[PDB]
Symmetry: C4
Subunit: 140 residues, 4 copies
């Protein structure tokens, strides 16, 4: 029996339970976005704004149900409307991560017919992050 | 008259007002668990999750009565159902504390007829803990 | 496309989106106060009391609407009633910032007919402040 | 005009606006307690428990009116019932401050007919305290 560690084992939603994505694996996810005609977008946050929190609820009456701070991140430029070139998306990932090297950065895509985000995963975490485990150290 | 210190004198429920348990005394408590047919289990927590706190109540209306965070700790493996060997329990204490050397670790036991925890006491505190007193320094 | 930074880019109300005021530009604003017969006043706050916060709302029922802590700063001496000399205002800025070199300091002016503050802008921030950007680093 | 400082200028109720009490002035206050037949008592607190705070109100509905944490301090021994000797009080101040050299310590006195604390003032603050001004630095 192995024990799943509760210490410094924070996750990041879709794909965070898998080995970290190689550049080839990221490119394949971008191909998927383009093949389906979805709108790519990049979002970023400083470490203190990265995970869901409750601080604003201090101002509330009994209305905190499904309210969390830090769900919104900051938009990198605009969503890439009409983009059908995967290389353009990859180039923006480089540009975003270069401008904000200490930020969490996630790649998302939107479906305008359902009007919802249809995909999303982390592409960068700051090198100073100490709150997550490598795959082989998630259980002990 | 001696004065009971309010400073760095945190306790840990059952047996925390006695001298720290020797290995022989721990083994005697394990014998008691086995003699009574109770189910041994180990639980652990990092220092920040060890003592009762109130943080989640920020999300509440007027319903905090008997709500506290950090009552739940993390289960080490599973409760040792059908265990009738004290040495097996002692070996799991060693294994748990080895995997989590900086965690608080407590030994508990369950009664499945009453469906309640029937015993429990701390078996490890992190060496970095500064918030407790020696038995002879509890009063000044 | 340039991206407006969300990191360490705190503002300070009126004139914060312009290049920092030169001594000549500050003098011109003081002239404006005097030309209009308004009442100059200086206010200051330590860094922890400088920006709007919510901490007191822990004590509230559902009445936090338009309540914020840190809107009030500390008055430097008294408002300069009857002041008809711009140099006198400039001298008090020097005096205030000298007494509190590590404080935020703002110059304000009051209109007693409308009974409202009619102007205001920051004249000093502590040299240790790192939560703001110069104009050329506001977008990347 | 002198400006009353808002920074690190915390007070301590009765007598805190006067020059610090000399040993002769403390002895005089003790004579006053004894002359009036009041009951001397010492109380103390670590720095984090010294000033009124709000933390427990996170657990409340709309009932925080005249609730504050840190009004209660810790009793040194017991109130000195039947004490008619000032030297005995002075000896307990020495003993208390010796046992808790890093604590805030206050001398108080009770009237059992009104059933209320009838006097009180600080006799020790920790040497590490940096949140107070000497009398000559309270205004600038």
């Amino acid at each position: 029996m192995m024990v799943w560690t509760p210490v410094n084992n924070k996750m990041f939603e879709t794909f965070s339970y898998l080995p970290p994505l190689t550049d080839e694996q990221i490119a394949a996810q971008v191909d998927y976005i383009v093949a389906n005609g979805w709108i790519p977008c990049l979002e970023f946050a400083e470490a203190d704004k990265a995970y869901v929190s409750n601080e604003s609820a201090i101002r509330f009456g009994s209305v905190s149900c499904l309210y969390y701070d830090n769900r919104y991140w900051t938009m990198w430029k605009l969503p890439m409307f009409g983009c059908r070139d995967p290389m353009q998306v990859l180039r923006e990932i480089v540009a975003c991560t270069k401008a904000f090297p200490d930020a969490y950065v996630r790649l998302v895509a939107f479906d305008n017919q359902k009007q919802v985000q249809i995909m999303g995963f982390l592409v960068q975490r700051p090198k100073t992050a100490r709150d997550f485990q490598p795959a082989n150290k998630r259980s002990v």
